Design a protein around this ligand. Sequence first.
Ligand SMILES: CCCCCCCCCCCCCCCCC[C@@H](O)O[C@H](CO[C@H](O)CCCCCCCCCCCCCCC)COP(=O)(O)OCC[N+](C)(C)C
Ligand SMILES: CCCCCCCC/C=C\CCCCCCCC(=O)O[C@H](COC(=O)CCCCCCC/C=C/CCCCCCCC)COP(=O)(O)OCCN
Lengths: 69, 83
Amino acid sequence: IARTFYDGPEKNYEKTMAILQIEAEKAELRLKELEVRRLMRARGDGPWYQYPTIDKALIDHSPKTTPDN
Amino acid sequence: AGRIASFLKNAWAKEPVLVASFAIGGLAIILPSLSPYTNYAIRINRATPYNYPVPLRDDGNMPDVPSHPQDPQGPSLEWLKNL
Ligand SMILES: CCCCCCCCCCCCCCCCC[C@@H](O)O[C@H](CO[C@H](O)CCCCCCCCCCCCCCC)COP(=O)(O)OCC[N+](C)(C)C
Ligand SMILES: CCCCCCCC/C=C\CCCCCCCC(=O)O[C@H](COC(=O)CCCCCCC/C=C/CCCCCCCC)COP(=O)(O)OCCN
């Protein structure tokens, strides 16, 4: 029965280790992502949460019929 | 091209005002694109000095910018005087 239908314990052992490593990495990544999101929303210095500002290319840098603009 | 003549005849017999209005409007749309004076009108509008011309700081590299209004450089409005 063991030869025909089942395998050794080493296979399940090492598969369990691989699964545990994947899940632990995923958990640490989720926590890190939450912290990064909080920091980016608080500060705004990162790529995320970059709300638009007025484009400076719309400014007209020409004499304005009045020296004091 | 043959039935349109009869249609125009009927319209002129019955609705001269509509025919006149449509002819005048069509002329109004199509004529300005075929006129050589619209460019002259644009240039006349562009040549009206509403604003003070601010002088440029001399750097020695403007052969085409006048130093005085009576200098030969700069745009000329002699086309407007003869227009
Ligand atoms: C000498 C023996 C004396 C005593 C007899 C004891 C009787 C025991 C037989 C009863 C078997 C119970 C069913 C349990 C089947 C386990 C299914 C599965 O777990 O096994 C698969 C193995 O496949 C097997 O071939 C399963 C075949 C059994 C199919 C059962 C069907 C029986 C129904 C018969 C009904 C009658 C039909 C006629 C209708 C009129 C696993 O696939 P695989 O990942 O690759 O193999 C991994 C292990 N390896 C790598 C070491 C090989
Ligand atoms: C491309 C130019 C377009 C812009 C110019 C137009 C300027 C403004 C004119 C349009 C104003 C509104 C249009 C009016 C539409 C009226 C249509 C209608 O249903 O009226 C008909 C009357 O008119 C008609 O029969 C239908 C159209 C008749 C001819 C209208 C013009 C057709 C084209 C004429 C000009 C063709 C191109 C120019 C060449 C001129 C020839 C040298 C019914 O008459 P009732 O008053 O209701 O009846 C009361 C009496 N029982």
